[PDB]
């Protein structure tokens with residue numbers, strides 16, 4: 001079940017980023033034990049009728065990248081502007097879209113409170129069927145549009161995926177893992193395997209096990225793998241150090257909420273200073289992923305690779321454990337007893353209970369009075385307290401405050 005990908009396309013200033021923001025998951029109410037993740041303006045996820053969808057704002061990519069996004073998407077949401085009417089640049093985009101071989105949903109944005117007949121008039125001639133009436137500023141028509149997008153769509157064990165930039169060692173590591181002691185192997189995107197009584201499925205969205213067998217980076221296919229997997233193994237290339245692009249990928253993993261293990265690959269042959277330099281770079285540039293187990297390996301020579309299986313099992317178990325309101329509240333009471341919340345404007349903040357908001361991203365909701373006066377430093381203290389109490393690894397703990405009712 002790979003998530004469908006919807007590419008938002010259209011001229012500048014039609015409302016693509018506004019619609020993207022309306023549809024995607026907001027993380028404004030969350031405070032993490034360690035900050036360091038921003039809101040992605042290119043890729044996101046949305047949910048409509050329980051069906052999760054990947055969204056790409058092609059305006060955030062700006063033509064090579066835009067063309068790649070369109071070619072790798074399942075459907076296309078093409079936005080035009082009711083206030084402008086049909087303009088020549090819309091027609092240029094339309095002709096390009098017709099040559100691709102995919103569904104085009106036409107959406108007329110900025111409809112505001114104008115009648116549909118007025119809004120849609122200029123756009124029937126584009127030949128993309130119904131010009132869906134929307135206003136991204138108010139939500140008008142958005143649910144109806146997304147319902148039409150949905151309607152026009154076609155033992156696993158622990159699912160894992162390798163994520164990383166080109167040439168970091170993904171195919172090498174896949175081949176090495178599948179050949180480790182006691183591993184047995186038996187559409188082509190899923191590769192089931194087992195080790196002892198442990199069942200796994202490798203997710204290979206870019207088909208790299210096949211290219212290695214016989215012989216272009218896709219952020220979309222990386223995101224699809226990340227959302228399909230239970231645990232991600234992110235590979236760094238120790239010879240290159242920590243790169244800006246590595247950080248962009250890691251951030252997306254953390255934002256997606258998926259369990260993470262870091263494999264620092266190509267560790268072989270490095271001297272004491274080289275190794276210490278890589279370690280120091282990780283500590284300086286990646287403290288936001290301290291919750292993730294990391295292993296220094298050589299996929300090529302096999303050194304340290306076997307440690308990954310227990311890391312997969314333990315990371316999965318950590319986020320899958322039972323987390324009742326009673327046990328979360330028991331932990332909250334203990335945290336408060338050890339370190340009392342500060343008085344704010346002279347009034348005491350009273351924290352009453354905690355419940356599980358979500359496992360991905362891990363969100364613990366803390367209820368009380370005057371909770372929004374809680375300094376962010378206290379929220380970070382609570383995040384760390386829950387982390388230690390339940391031994392959360394592979395995912396960061398987020399605290400969401402709620403001042404009931």
Ligand SMILES: Nc1nc2c(ncn2[C@@H]2O[C@H](COP(=O)(O)OP(=O)(O)O)[C@@H](O)[C@H]2O)c(=O)[nH]1
Nearest residue numbers: 012013014015016017018059110111135136137
């Ligand atoms: N009146 C109106 N303005 C909108 C609507 N949606 C977006 N806008 C505005 O149109 C402008 C362009 O929007 P933006 O999302 O940046 O367009 P993009 O360049 O396609 O990403 C911004 O000022 C938005 O606030 C809408 O439904 N109605």
Ligand SMILES: Nc1nc2c(ncn2[C@@H]2O[C@H](COP(=O)(O)OP(=O)(O)O)[C@@H](O)[C@H]2O)c(=O)[nH]1
Nearest residue numbers: 166167168169170171172265266298299300301
């Ligand atoms: N020295 C060394 N080279 C490696 C290691 N892992 C992969 N490589 C090399 O790095 C290159 C890219 O490996 P590959 O698995 O194709 O990377 P992918 O693009 O991430 O799938 C190849 O030349 C590999 O032999 C390693 O652990 N040590």
